[PDB]
Design a protein around this ligand. Structure first.
Ligand SMILES: [Mg+2]
Ligand SMILES: [Mg+2]
Ligand SMILES: [Mg+2]
Ligand SMILES: [Mg+2]
Ligand SMILES: [Mg+2]
Ligand SMILES: [Mg+2]
Ligand SMILES: [Mg+2]
Ligand SMILES: [Mg+2]
Ligand SMILES: [Mg+2]
Ligand SMILES: [Mg+2]
Ligand SMILES: [Mg+2]
Ligand SMILES: [Mg+2]
Ligand SMILES: [Mg+2]
Ligand SMILES: [Mg+2]
Ligand SMILES: [Mg+2]
Ligand SMILES: [Mg+2]
Ligand SMILES: [Mg+2]
Ligand SMILES: [Mg+2]
Ligand SMILES: [Mg+2]
Ligand SMILES: [Mg+2]
Ligand SMILES: [Mg+2]
Ligand SMILES: [Mg+2]
Ligand SMILES: [Mg+2]
Ligand SMILES: [Mg+2]
Ligand SMILES: [Mg+2]
Ligand SMILES: [Mg+2]
Ligand SMILES: [Mg+2]
Ligand SMILES: [Mg+2]
Ligand SMILES: [Mg+2]
Ligand SMILES: [Mg+2]
Ligand SMILES: [Mg+2]
Ligand SMILES: [Mg+2]
Ligand SMILES: [Mg+2]
Ligand SMILES: [Mg+2]
Ligand SMILES: [Mg+2]
Ligand SMILES: [Mg+2]
Ligand SMILES: [Mg+2]
Ligand SMILES: [Mg+2]
Ligand SMILES: [Mg+2]
Ligand SMILES: [Mg+2]
Ligand SMILES: [Mg+2]
Ligand SMILES: [Mg+2]
Ligand SMILES: [Mg+2]
Ligand SMILES: [Mg+2]
Ligand SMILES: [Mg+2]
Ligand SMILES: [Mg+2]
Ligand SMILES: [Mg+2]
Ligand SMILES: [Mg+2]
Ligand SMILES: [Mg+2]
Ligand SMILES: [Mg+2]
Ligand SMILES: [Mg+2]
Ligand SMILES: [Mg+2]
Ligand SMILES: [Mg+2]
Ligand SMILES: [Mg+2]
Ligand SMILES: [Mg+2]
Ligand SMILES: [Mg+2]
Ligand SMILES: [Mg+2]
Ligand SMILES: [Mg+2]
Ligand SMILES: [Mg+2]
Ligand SMILES: [Mg+2]
Ligand SMILES: [Mg+2]
Ligand SMILES: [Mg+2]
Ligand SMILES: [Mg+2]
Ligand SMILES: [Mg+2]
Ligand SMILES: [Mg+2]
Ligand SMILES: [Mg+2]
Ligand SMILES: [Mg+2]
Ligand SMILES: [Mg+2]
Ligand SMILES: [Mg+2]
Ligand SMILES: [Mg+2]
Ligand SMILES: [Mg+2]
Ligand SMILES: [Mg+2]
Ligand SMILES: [Mg+2]
Ligand SMILES: [Mg+2]
Ligand SMILES: [Mg+2]
Ligand SMILES: [Mg+2]
Ligand SMILES: [Mg+2]
Ligand SMILES: [Mg+2]
Ligand SMILES: [Mg+2]
Ligand SMILES: [Mg+2]
Ligand SMILES: [Mg+2]
Ligand SMILES: [Mg+2]
Ligand SMILES: [Mg+2]
Ligand SMILES: [Mg+2]
Ligand SMILES: [Mg+2]
Ligand SMILES: [Mg+2]
Ligand SMILES: [Mg+2]
Ligand SMILES: [Mg+2]
Ligand SMILES: [Mg+2]
Ligand SMILES: [Mg+2]
Ligand SMILES: [Mg+2]
Ligand SMILES: [Mg+2]
Ligand SMILES: [Mg+2]
Ligand SMILES: [Mg+2]
Ligand SMILES: [Mg+2]
Ligand SMILES: [Mg+2]
Ligand SMILES: [Mg+2]
Ligand SMILES: [Mg+2]
Ligand SMILES: [Mg+2]
Ligand SMILES: [Mg+2]
Ligand SMILES: [Mg+2]
Ligand SMILES: [Mg+2]
Ligand SMILES: [Mg+2]
Ligand SMILES: [Mg+2]
Ligand SMILES: [Mg+2]
Ligand SMILES: [Mg+2]
Ligand SMILES: [Mg+2]
Ligand SMILES: [Mg+2]
Ligand SMILES: [Mg+2]
Ligand SMILES: [Mg+2]
Ligand SMILES: [Mg+2]
Ligand SMILES: [Mg+2]
Ligand SMILES: [Mg+2]
Ligand SMILES: [Mg+2]
Ligand SMILES: [Mg+2]
Ligand SMILES: [Mg+2]
Ligand SMILES: [Mg+2]
Ligand SMILES: [Mg+2]
Ligand SMILES: [Mg+2]
Ligand SMILES: [Mg+2]
Ligand SMILES: [Mg+2]
Ligand SMILES: [Mg+2]
Ligand SMILES: [Mg+2]
Ligand SMILES: [Mg+2]
Ligand SMILES: [Mg+2]
Ligand SMILES: [Zn+2]
Lengths: 58, 159, 105, 205
RNA sequence: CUCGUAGCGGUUCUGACGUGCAAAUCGAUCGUCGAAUUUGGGUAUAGGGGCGAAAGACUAAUCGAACCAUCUAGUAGCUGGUUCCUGCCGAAGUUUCCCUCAGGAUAGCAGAAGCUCGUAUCAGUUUUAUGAGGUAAAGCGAAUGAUUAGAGGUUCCGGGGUCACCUUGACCUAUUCUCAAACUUUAAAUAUGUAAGAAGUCCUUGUUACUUAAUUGAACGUGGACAUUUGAAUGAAGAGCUUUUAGUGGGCCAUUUUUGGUAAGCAGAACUGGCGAUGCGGGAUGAACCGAACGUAGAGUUAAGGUGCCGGAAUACACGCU
RNA sequence: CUAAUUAAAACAUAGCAUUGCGAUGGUCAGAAAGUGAUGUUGACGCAAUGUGAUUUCUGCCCAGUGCUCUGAAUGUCAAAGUGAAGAAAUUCAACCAAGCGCGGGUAAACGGCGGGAGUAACUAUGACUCUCUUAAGGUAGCCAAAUGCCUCGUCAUCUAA
RNA sequence: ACAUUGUCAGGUGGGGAGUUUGGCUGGGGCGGCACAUCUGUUAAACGAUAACGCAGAUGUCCUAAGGGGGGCUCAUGGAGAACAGAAAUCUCCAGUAGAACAAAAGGGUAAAAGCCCCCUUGAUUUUGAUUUUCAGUGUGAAUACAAACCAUGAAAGUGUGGCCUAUCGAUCCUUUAGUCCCUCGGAAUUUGAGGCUAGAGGUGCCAGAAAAGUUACCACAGGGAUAACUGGCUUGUGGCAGUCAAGCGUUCAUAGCGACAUUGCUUUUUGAUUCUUCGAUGUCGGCUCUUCCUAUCAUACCGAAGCAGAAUUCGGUAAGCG
RNA sequence: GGUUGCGGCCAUAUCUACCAGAAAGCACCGUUUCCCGUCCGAUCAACUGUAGUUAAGCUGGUAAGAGCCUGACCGAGUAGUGUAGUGGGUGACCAUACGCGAAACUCAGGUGCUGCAAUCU
């Protein structure tokens, strides 16, 4: 038998029961979709900086 | 039946804004975008490549990636009861800088400048913004300003 | 759909690894070949009493198949497969579009 | 074999016009919208009387005919058919549908009606000042063919124009007024003086 | 063959009876009554079988597949029922998929168990700055499409009317009346994105295989300067995170915006509040309206609604109208 | 005859007709059998059907479907068998019975049995004619019939209606 | 030495056996597809949003209609040229697109994305990321890069199909391509087979069973989630009233009427709906018998008449009585 | 300040009509062997700044010009609209309260500004 197709009634009250969450940002996001050539050079630019701060202090 | 294509309900959104059709002016292609800049999204209807979905019109996000002709943009989208990060691959004619991030950076520079003139002398310079305040005491003169006004007006039809 | 019977395309030949000339033909499937393991299992399952044991498809809806081009490299004799969209007609020979010319029939 | 007008009295729908999607709309039976001495000069008919709607409703084209004929015939009989000018100022552009038992119940076009507001003129008449009682009586006779409430307002404008009677006299005993066939043209302070001399000689004195 | 007893049936009363005398009888009226008659006993045919002058009839009150026992406590998305108290928290009728539509899975809502930390971490809110939108309105002497009336301009664009003439189709020009869910130059209100900093800002110089004509940039860095008015408001009820699982997946009503329909206590959407799941005071009465949400009491004040009497509270006071 | 709601117009019947079968057979049983029913039978018989006394008649159609036919024997064709190639499993090829295909017969087999136009010295009516498709185009008869929707058809009769 | 009998093989075989005979749905069936989709609108200016809502469209087509480059500008009009006129060609002027871009509709596009020419295969290879549908699964489609190899152009650049928004498909099985790679488990060689990676063959009910009917002889589980009859809401339709008065009524709107319009009432018609009842509210009509309503046919008393009488017609109080 | 080359914002720059432009530049203009391109050296290509010219282009100005742009306590706090009431009205709708707030219209003003390089009485 015919019934109720669709409604958005009560859905915002359900979403605000736990009160819509912001996704909790961090320092250093991931490199997901960051350009691969930049990533390849970033690897070596951080390798050399690890060695530079190693030799600076020892 | 029903229709939910990629550019459905975009009759007016991707229209090209009276007497501004045709070629895109060149400052659009010479603006420089760094990773971390806050950009606005408004799709040009005349360029069909790199084109954002209609959800992202009027949305404002952060550049995470820079490519040959395009930038990637982080946009927070409200899926159900939480926010999901969306990564967008948009060409730079669908992208413009946010003027809010201009205005806040001159406020940062003004804050540093007045803190320097407070360090020179006169500490506690009170450098936060304030909301609009209730007005102070005035004295209103009646000099060439004698308060003269009539009454409400009678009804006439003037048809 | 008219496709030329020769194509200058990439080769995964490992002594080509570059764009070479390819002879283009169509892919037809091949004989179903008894002693394939599914055919052996199917004959054993259909053996005896019990009737038909696997589903026999009836409710077909497509009137087209996808055209599969068989790209044979003229240099190293290695082959490749390309799929085209649904077409009701597929040619391989000539008769290019002579454009600026009055109609026939 | 026609639904009573209380079925289609109120503006309950979005305006459904005859378009490239409608395509099968029966003709409006009101086809004449100016009556009387329509060719008359603006100076001929200074007094304007308006029949004005007080309600937000729909007027059927049948009712528009039925009121136009009654007002026209009373004014023709009592005052002569070349002593007034009558204008129907609403046009039945909205298509009323009829569904002739609820599956697939979208309606086919029944007729044509005119969507009126509070304060729209339905009928405007211009006459001489001496014809006022006949025109008011003709419009009050035409009230009975329309549902809802309608007021008879005497306009403070000269004729069918959009400026006051002393303002129009100040404009025509000066030189900013020249005749058209049934309406009038006004002289502006803007435009080429060669064209504003080509028309309007009688100004610039 | 016939009328008609016995017999054998079973027409009609649609009689009686209809918790009967009776799980099919009683009475009257009827059909037939010497044979395809009626009947006893013996015998044969047994369940997907028999037997049938055929009604799916009959086969032990059982027949469109008897009866008995077992498999078997067959299966049921369907219906009923489901047993002590008190406390604390507390829903959903919505998303996606399904031979899915009386059912499931899945997400959400809900409880529990907590874990990591301890002041602002954040917020169904405002402000300021900055975006985005094409709905209401508006417009049509702006485009597209409709649409009313005239005027001006001479033509083998097949008007007859001289072979340049009152009575010309249009077309253009300037006006005029009126409109549009699938029209629009313009364009709100409400709703909506971002930002309002210590992961911040400046100064100097380290990395690299990316980038540049070029340490030019890019990204990440070292070292240094800036101390809570550290960068609007108000609040924060602690904040953040994890696992697990119940029920639900028929909804309905009101205000506003809406679609179809003449309409409906009709059918279907949008936002919020409610009922469901909820008593209390008021609307006589009532799921939803107004008011207000509830431990047990006491006192006081109220809301909504009232104050002739039923009925607690002024047959108050006042200006009129009927 | 539907025991216990239907006694009939239903079923049966005589009559009529069709079909199969001459016995190492027809039709039908049985798990099998050195087994059975018809059959202690033999075509005036057994078996399967349809129609349903008498009278009078039973029209046309073999396209469809069924049934049937010493009917055509390189169309299709399985297993075995044959040939080739292969190391062999195997693959390929030729042959390939019945059946189907082809052709014929058969309606007291199942069944089926049309539209329009132009036409008579009337106006419509249409002996006749023409194409449109058919396998044939509903014949003799009968009928608003227990079969006719429209329909309570039209006329007559029966009645005051 | 054929029958017979045994085994296997092909045919025939509703005689019999088993099973199936989608869904949505203003009840169901028929119809349609609102079942996978695309454009505009509905849709209430973020997004999302329903109905068997409205107007349409998809299961294709294209070796160019894909890619790159270059030159040019289109529709339409006007003014001119032998045939030649409204339409054939040629020339000039105007022309913001009023053209074209495969196919719906919307968006977009003018030294172009249109038209014409030149060169081509980037409609290629590898495997990730992202967007939209969304559960942030799949599939389809799209975006931006990276590693190659190319095309094109002088080049910057562009090109991972079609200017963008539709144009499509799991597991199992079969087949092909790829390395010449793994395995056949006592050790080998060679066939065969199995495997790994990538496509195809197809599920349109489009997240994908292998599927005809009928039941009036019927059965069960249920369902007032849902029809048939009362009631309830509504009142299109039916019925009954009113206003206005063109006109009829020998002159004369209104004695009686009354067009074109328009406002109502009723619930004795029929639709509309599906709220109540499916662990049953006895379903048509007649007979009998009571009461009630009034929108009065008769009877009582009146008013009006195109009421002379007679007979009528309109109207009032009135349901007492027939 | 003119002009050129390359621009930015893309009409305050466009459009219609008329009138001026010294100097330099730009331009029209002159020639066809060569590279190249056409049916046509018209366009494209090459060569000479020579034979000539400001006629056009181009620039600037004028116009109670069209358009465009800006502003206005001009319309107008109008239309619309968020919130509220056991407000009004049979209804259609409307008023009030606390807020936000258009468009057409009507007036007035304006009619390109500017970056890099080079050149010029
Ligand atoms: Mg159903
Ligand atoms: Mg539901
Ligand atoms: Mg809602
Ligand atoms: Mg909740
Ligand atoms: Mg939620
Ligand atoms: Mg769409
Ligand atoms: Mg669009
Ligand atoms: Mg826009
Ligand atoms: Mg593309
Ligand atoms: Mg296999
Ligand atoms: Mg086995
Ligand atoms: Mg296919
Ligand atoms: Mg009616
Ligand atoms: Mg409506
Ligand atoms: Mg009225
Ligand atoms: Mg006898
Ligand atoms: Mg007898
Ligand atoms: Mg008896
Ligand atoms: Mg009895
Ligand atoms: Mg008897
Ligand atoms: Mg008898
Ligand atoms: Mg007898
Ligand atoms: Mg006897
Ligand atoms: Mg006898
Ligand atoms: Mg015995
Ligand atoms: Mg027996
Ligand atoms: Mg059995
Ligand atoms: Mg029985
Ligand atoms: Mg039993
Ligand atoms: Mg059990
Ligand atoms: Mg029970
Ligand atoms: Mg609680
Ligand atoms: Mg259930
Ligand atoms: Mg239930
Ligand atoms: Mg869950
Ligand atoms: Mg919870
Ligand atoms: Mg709009
Ligand atoms: Mg819209
Ligand atoms: Mg609005
Ligand atoms: Mg509007
Ligand atoms: Mg217009
Ligand atoms: Mg709308
Ligand atoms: Mg608009
Ligand atoms: Mg804040
Ligand atoms: Mg739980
Ligand atoms: Mg349910
Ligand atoms: Mg409802
Ligand atoms: Mg419940
Ligand atoms: Mg409550
Ligand atoms: Mg109350
Ligand atoms: Mg109460
Ligand atoms: Mg009450
Ligand atoms: Mg309230
Ligand atoms: Mg309480
Ligand atoms: Mg008291
Ligand atoms: Mg019995
Ligand atoms: Mg009986
Ligand atoms: Mg009998
Ligand atoms: Mg009986
Ligand atoms: Mg019988
Ligand atoms: Mg015997
Ligand atoms: Mg008989
Ligand atoms: Mg007979
Ligand atoms: Mg035959
Ligand atoms: Mg063989
Ligand atoms: Mg034959
Ligand atoms: Mg014969
Ligand atoms: Mg016979
Ligand atoms: Mg027949
Ligand atoms: Mg006959
Ligand atoms: Mg007959
Ligand atoms: Mg009869
Ligand atoms: Mg009869
Ligand atoms: Mg033998
Ligand atoms: Mg045998
Ligand atoms: Mg079989
Ligand atoms: Mg069978
Ligand atoms: Mg069967
Ligand atoms: Mg239905
Ligand atoms: Mg159907
Ligand atoms: Mg649906
Ligand atoms: Mg889906
Ligand atoms: Mg909205
Ligand atoms: Mg939207
Ligand atoms: Mg609609
Ligand atoms: Mg729909
Ligand atoms: Mg489709
Ligand atoms: Mg080009
Ligand atoms: Mg095509
Ligand atoms: Mg998904
Ligand atoms: Mg998931
Ligand atoms: Mg798709
Ligand atoms: Mg693509
Ligand atoms: Mg590339
Ligand atoms: Mg593609
Ligand atoms: Mg592409
Ligand atoms: Mg294409
Ligand atoms: Mg193209
Ligand atoms: Mg499987
Ligand atoms: Mg395999
Ligand atoms: Mg091994
Ligand atoms: Mg080993
Ligand atoms: Mg072994
Ligand atoms: Mg080995
Ligand atoms: Mg092998
Ligand atoms: Mg193999
Ligand atoms: Mg691959
Ligand atoms: Mg496939
Ligand atoms: Mg599906
Ligand atoms: Mg699906
Ligand atoms: Mg039952
Ligand atoms: Mg119900
Ligand atoms: Mg109704
Ligand atoms: Mg009614
Ligand atoms: Mg009615
Ligand atoms: Mg009335
Ligand atoms: Mg009279
Ligand atoms: Mg019950
Ligand atoms: Mg009863
Ligand atoms: Mg009365
Ligand atoms: Mg009376
Ligand atoms: Mg009497
Ligand atoms: Mg009485
Ligand atoms: Mg009485
Ligand atoms: Mg030259
Ligand atoms: Zn190769």
């Amino acid at each position: 038998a015919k019934s109720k197709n669709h409604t958005a009634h009560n859905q915002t009250r359900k979403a605000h029961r736990n009160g819509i969450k912001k996704p909790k940002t961090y320092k250093y996001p991931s490199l997901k979709g960051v350009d691969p050539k930049f990533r390849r050079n970033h690897k070596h630019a951080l390798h050399g900086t690890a060695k530079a701060l190693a030799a600076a202090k020892k | 039946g029903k229709s939910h294509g990629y550019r459905s309900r975009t009759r007016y959104m991707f229209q090209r804004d009276f007497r501004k059709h045709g070629a895109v002016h060149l400052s659009t292609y010479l603006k420089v975008y760094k990773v971390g800049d806050i950009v606005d999204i408004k799709a040009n209807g005349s360029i069909q490549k790199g084109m954002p979905h209609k959800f992202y019109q009027g949305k404002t996000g952060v550049v995470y990636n820079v490519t040959k002709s395009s930038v990637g943009v982080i946009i927070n989208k409200m899926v159900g009861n939480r926010y999901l990060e969306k990564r967008l691959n948009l060409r730079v004619e669908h992208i413009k800088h946010s003027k809010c991030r201009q205005e806040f950076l001159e406020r940062v520079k003004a804050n540093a400048a007045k803190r320097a003139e407070a360090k020179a002398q006169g500490v506690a310079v009170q450098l936060k913004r304030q909301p609009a305040q209730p007005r102070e005491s005035r004295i209103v003169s009646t000099e060439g300003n004698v308060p003269q006004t009539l009454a409400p007006v009678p009804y006439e039809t003037f048809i | 759909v008219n496709v030329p019977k020769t194509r200058k395309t990439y080769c995964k030949g490992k002594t080509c690894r570059k764009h070479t000339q390819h002879k283009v033909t169509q892919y037809k499937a091949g004989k179903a070949s008894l002693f394939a393991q599914g055919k052996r299992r199917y004959d054993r399952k259909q053996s005896g009493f019990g009737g038909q044991t696997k589903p026999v498809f009836h409710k077909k809806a497509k009137t087209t198949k996808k055209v599969v081009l068989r790209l044979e490299c003229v240099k190293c004799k290695t082959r490749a497969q390309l799929t085209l969209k649904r077409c009701k007609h597929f040619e391989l020979g000539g008769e290019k579009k002579q454009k600026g010319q009055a109609l026939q029939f | 074999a026609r639904r009573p007008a209380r079925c289609y009295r109120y503006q309950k729908n979005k305006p459904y016009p005859k378009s490239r999607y409608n395509r099968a709309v029966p003709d409006s039976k009101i086809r004449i919208y100016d009556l009387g001495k329509k060719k008359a000069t603006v100076d001929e008919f200074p007094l304007c009387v308006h029949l004005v709607s007080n309600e937000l409703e729909q007027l059927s084209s049948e009712a528009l005919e039925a009121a136009r004929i009654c007002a026209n015939k009373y004014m023709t009989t009592v005052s002569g058919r070349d002593a007034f000018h009558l204008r129907v100022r609403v046009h039945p552009f909205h298509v009323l549908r009829i569904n002739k038992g609820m599956r697939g119940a979208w309606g086919k076009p029944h007729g044509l009606a005119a969507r009126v507001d509070i304060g729209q003129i339905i009928f405007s008449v211009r006459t001489k000042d001496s014809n006022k009682d006949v025109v008011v009586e003709g419009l009050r006779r035409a009230r009975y063919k329309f549902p809802g409430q309608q007021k008879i307002i005497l306009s403070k404008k000269w004729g069918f124009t959009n400026l006051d009677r002393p303002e129009y006299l100040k404009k025509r005993e000066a030189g900013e007024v020249k005749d058209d066939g049934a309406f009038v043209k006004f002289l502006s302070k803007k435009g080429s003086l060669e064209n504003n001399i080509r028309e309007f000689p009688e100004y610039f004195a």
